[PDB]
Amino acid sequence: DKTVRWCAVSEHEATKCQSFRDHMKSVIPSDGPSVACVKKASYLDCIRAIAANEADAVTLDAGWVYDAYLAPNNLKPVVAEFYGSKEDPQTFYYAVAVVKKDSGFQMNQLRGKKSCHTGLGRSAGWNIPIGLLYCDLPEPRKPLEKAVANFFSGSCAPCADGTDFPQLCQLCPGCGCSTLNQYFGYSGAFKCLKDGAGDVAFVKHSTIFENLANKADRDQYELLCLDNTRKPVDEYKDCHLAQVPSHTVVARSMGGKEDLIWELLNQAQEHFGKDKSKEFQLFSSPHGKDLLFKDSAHGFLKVPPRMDAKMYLGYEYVTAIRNLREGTC
Template identity: 30%
Template sequence: MAKFLSFMATILIIATAFTGCLNQVDEDIIKIAYKTQDDYNDASANPQLLADFITAQSGFTVELYPISSDIAAIEALRFGHADIAFLDGGAAFIAWKQHGLDVILANQNSDGSTFYTAQAWVLENSSIQSLEDLEGKNSCHTGWLKSAGMLMPMGYMINNGLIEVSEEIDEIDSLRTIIENHFGTATIPEKGDLYYGYSGGFRCMTEGVGDVAFVKSTSYEDHCEGNDWCLDRSEYRLLSPAFGRVPSHPMMINMEIMSQEKMDIIADAFLALNSAEGGSEILEGVLNTPGISEVTTEGHLGSYSDAIGTIPGIANFFDEKYDS
């Protein structure tokens, strides 16, 4: 019996040591989920440049974990096949709300911010004074299911009781009917149409096609310089409150299986892109951003999630959209 117990104790020690070695190997490797391709016509877009930079900054071996979709990236984080992944706002919403993944960093916009604000504009002489006055008015949207032009304003107004939606409705296509029932005539352009996009939505309102434009808080500054269809700034007015922040692409991790030490090392290595030699070229060429900022999950995705989370069928829509 004593020999048996001694044998089992030895086996346990060996197994524990072996497991520890495996964990140590995993801790010394950073795996980045990334949509890779066989050849890069533009060498500056090759994600291996990013991997090599993070290796140099962290001292870890960095590997690219190939994924074919944002849903695949989320699954890779969930099951520990990858340590980090860059997602867009919709995919990040799914990753956070359905799977408990967290944001630690985010791409910067051209002005250094990590979000833009979705807000409505009207002409200064409009009778519309508040969001409550929008019922029955003609609306200008940037396109079908666009964040600032549709999902954020509709989600905000549904969430705050300005638009009533039956609890039985759970299909994203029902949003078109909800919009048509609430507004007078809704302009929902397709790509290529005159009023498509942020500039088009603002122009739609400026030219009197709609009474309100659902765009960005910075739309006048962004789109009126050099455009002869724009009026003077004094002839426009922002409606308050804003609908919330639309987040830039965040970098997400699974905090349930990543140590705090490793998370800090990863964050510091990526933040070094902002200042280290060769960092700016990788930011622009690989990540398509001028910089990276440290953020929190709630701070980065909170108001976006609050708004779009009330859109009927939004979760199913995102699941289908990002699984391709």
């Protein structure tokens, strides 16, 4: 029992958060956990906010979890999302590269094409794909943004600095780091491809199924597999770039209300999880997709006691990120 200050990024998430608050009030008795909403412009401001005791929690893509960990913020993961089904929860998802059918190019011919990324530093939209092309990039490979800017002939990399690297915001001027940028995130990176701005979208396996309901329409897209061949979109299991850890809620290491955060989310999923309520849905919203939590999530799992970002993410993934931020060929 007490108040959890959730950090929403921009207007759409702020709206979902208000609804989340109000509905939780109509079901949770006076002594249960409650929600308060803090609006910030980017996930980055949410991190600082939480570290400065301005807010208490926020869900981040694993790549951004790593950023949350670095000093002086030192946030830790307390609750993770799980996908698939409640019967067989999956704490990972597949990063895929979606292209249009017959666009005429494989993974080893990305140079010169236009790319759509979910956001700078995110697992599927950035780390995995760039990680795999790292040495294909033209030297110098530092700064990384600059090298990526020269490989593609323009792209949309939300959260990148459009001043220092104009080419990274060519498909989405300003590189807005929130849903105010129509090309932000999974569904945004997908729209960037669908509209014809970009040639490839680095998203997750469920994105396309989340945006195109007709097999007819999904049939017009393909996935680039690491063996330089193309496969239909529902064959991602045999055509993906990598498996990455699930998004997770982070909190302060000192006085971070981790117990209250879990009590809230656990009670929230019971009352408003998948197909649980007609008045409100935690994993959906008419105001946007992947607001606060991913729509493709089914519930929450508590993270083991005092586990740090490094352990949570894993040796390999955590290294891939380091290598990306330095690495050699």
